Design a protein around this ligand. Sequence first.
Ligand SMILES: Cc1cc2nc3c(=O)[nH]c(=O)nc-3n(C[C@H](O)[C@H](O)[C@H](O)COP(=O)(O)OP(=O)(O)OC[C@H]3O[C@@H](n4cnc5c(N)ncnc54)[C@H](O)[C@@H]3O)c2cc1C
Ligand SMILES: Cc1cc2nc3c(=O)[nH]c(=O)nc-3n(C[C@H](O)[C@H](O)[C@H](O)COP(=O)(O)OP(=O)(O)OC[C@H]3O[C@@H](n4cnc5c(N)ncnc54)[C@H](O)[C@@H]3O)c2cc1C
Lengths: 393, 393
Amino acid sequence: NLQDARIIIAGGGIGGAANALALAQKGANVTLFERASEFGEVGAGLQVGPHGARILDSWGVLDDVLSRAFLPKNIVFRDAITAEVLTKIDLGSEFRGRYGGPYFVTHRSDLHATLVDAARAAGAELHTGVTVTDVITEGDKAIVSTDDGRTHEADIALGMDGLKSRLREKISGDEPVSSGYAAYRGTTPYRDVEEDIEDVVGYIGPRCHFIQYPLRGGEMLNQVAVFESPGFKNGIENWGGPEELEQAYAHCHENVRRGIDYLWKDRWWPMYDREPIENWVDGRMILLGDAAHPPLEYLASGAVMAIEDAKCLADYAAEDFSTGGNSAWPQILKEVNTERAPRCNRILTTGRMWGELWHLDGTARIARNELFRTRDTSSYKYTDWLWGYSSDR
Amino acid sequence: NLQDARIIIAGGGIGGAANALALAQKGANVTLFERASEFGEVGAGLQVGPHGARILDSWGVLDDVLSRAFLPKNIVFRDAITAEVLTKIDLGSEFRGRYGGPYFVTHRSDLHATLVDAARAAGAELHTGVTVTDVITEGDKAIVSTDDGRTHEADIALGMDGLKSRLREKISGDEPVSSGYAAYRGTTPYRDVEEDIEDVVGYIGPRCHFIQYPLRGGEMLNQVAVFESPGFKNGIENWGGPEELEQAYAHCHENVRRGIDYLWKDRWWPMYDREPIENWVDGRMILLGDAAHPPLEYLASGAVMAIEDAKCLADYAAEDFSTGGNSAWPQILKEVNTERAPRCNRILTTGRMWGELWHLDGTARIARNELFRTRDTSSYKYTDWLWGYSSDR
Ligand SMILES: Cc1cc2nc3c(=O)[nH]c(=O)nc-3n(C[C@H](O)[C@H](O)[C@H](O)COP(=O)(O)OP(=O)(O)OC[C@H]3O[C@@H](n4cnc5c(N)ncnc54)[C@H](O)[C@@H]3O)c2cc1C
Ligand SMILES: Cc1cc2nc3c(=O)[nH]c(=O)nc-3n(C[C@H](O)[C@H](O)[C@H](O)COP(=O)(O)OP(=O)(O)OC[C@H]3O[C@@H](n4cnc5c(N)ncnc54)[C@H](O)[C@@H]3O)c2cc1C
């Protein structure tokens, strides 16, 4: 275990909170700096497959999380134009048996608050309203600077400052790559939404998709609309605005079009990712979460990847640190990097392809529809790589 | 039977020859006018599925045709970039059992000469070097004008003057619609072509395909390359020239690229079709063959459709004419039109989609490839509509 280790975490999102919890459960001294003045996430849904569920259970927080979550029966793909079901992924007991946990959906804010509170309970020292302005390595320590003039010493630091990470600049000059798709969200009271839904339902169509699922044991309905923005292709800086919505879904089924009216219009998420990179480490600093591997939303695994990052790091560290102390941190970081890069980078890359597959038109959509419909649903070859992965060695 | 009937056929291609044979076998008086000074087709291959094979057998000419033909074992689809097999259609005995004939390939010129000779043997009067310049209906007869100043009387006339039919102008002002794909052909001695091929092999790729099959009992190899012409999209009148070939296949596998060198470069077929039409009849004139339903090459059924046209017409006429004589011709023509239009027009329309499916790129090609690979090969749902059709009533 990590009793003698000091780790500093720049960033307090799902990633940084998950890592605080994982490490402090191992007895490490953890200090986390979050820029925002309170901890919080959007009060909208996210999806957490069994690859994340499992890990939350090993942390002892899954039951509590499930008590405020929803357990869908299936993932259902529908054609966005005809509303016709193309296929289902069964989330029943064979699925739970094989992957070792439920696929569930919950409020981001609830999941985030659960991890913060459990990190706090495990002994992690968390600080809001504090921006990390620099990390360098000197001798065998990470030196972290904060925007109040202080510097802090630790054995390693974790750069978990998200998609627009400034700590990533130590390792790479790349910029975010726009997919040209904008994402809108909504949460409505179930009853108020205009039949019944017990699943994650994804309507896929040319240049768009529309996702729905219940939350809080059937009481809320989350809705997400993602569409290709004409404005991005014409050079607009603040592209994807709400005026584009109606024209974006005009070709789609009524079920999809009714859905548009429940969305929040005062805020949206233009969708970026980054080209995959191999190396995430700089001396005694490692990038994790969106800072190292920000994906497009299609595999619903960005936050799950950060959760995996946390487990892997804590597991690899607790194994190696017991015997070689502070001196072993760089080898540990490297080994975490080697395990995590291939896995996460395939998600980045396959996520782009999967997304493109949702958005086909013309003859390509006919082929796509028929491919989904005629598949062997007992086979797990499209999904084992994603849901069946573990970092255990 | 049709002993008392006089039919005039404008056009002497596979269509018009097939119709001469069908009708003269029923005892009709047949006169055919062909514009070219000799009968002949290109000395290159075509494909004749069981939907045409069957009919040739009922005419008594299939055995003779088969003695100069090739019988492939399969239709094999390969990815034009990787050369990887995507799927096969088995042409074995289950296939022959179900559809009632072989799928075969032969020289167009051989098939054409066989039908001409058998039409001649059945009593059809054939005339080369004679252009039909007009057909009108008067009272209960078709009056046909020829480019030597003569007019000719018959009970009906068949307009089988091909893709660029001028008789079609009596019924419709439409023009040929360019697909923007150009087709090149080649026939090489089998041995001289650079492993072994016993099938129809179709390499499908972005913006192109390349088809191969043996002829004359394994002695020749037919090769066909079809590619999207950059020149068509830029407004060139005589588009699809041979200079475009190399760039068109540069992205493809070596097997495909070696293939390009065997093609005839001094002649090519830019590919046109026409929007489907319902009505083919004008008084006592019916359009048949390419004049009524010219397809793109993808289902390999243009000439087969003309062969079906012949059978249907002769069968429907011999049934109805025995009892109501010359007076029944318009009702006969209408009934042939009603049987044949839905069938042929679905071929026109599905042929476009099938073609587009061959030419996908990007993620769409990945979906397409996987769709071909994972299909139930024992199922016949993609093919019954095409190969299992009969006009028998
Ligand atoms: C529309 C949409 C839907 C999604 N759905 C899903 C889903 O269903 N399932 C799923 O698993 N994933 C999903 N994701 C991905 C997921 O939201 C992210 O991958 C995940 O939140 C990344 O977490 P993170 O902690 O690495 O980074 P972030 O969550 O971006 O948090 C980084 C934190 O660091 C703070 N920060 C920044 N700079 C500094 C600094 N210098 N010092 C201190 N703090 C700093 C920020 O304030 C922020 O709180 C989705 C993403 C989007 C856009
Ligand atoms: C590259 C390519 C590959 C193909 N492969 C296949 C295949 O594999 N299988 C298949 O089944 N089909 C195939 N086809 C389709 C097939 O070639 C045609 O559909 C078929 O030949 C049409 O026959 P037709 O007799 O109706 O018309 P045409 O064959 O065009 O013949 C019409 C005839 O009428 C004559 N004519 C024109 N005007 C007059 C007039 N005023 N008076 C007298 N005569 C006139 C012309 O000289 C011509 O001989 C292919 C086509 C192409 C372009």
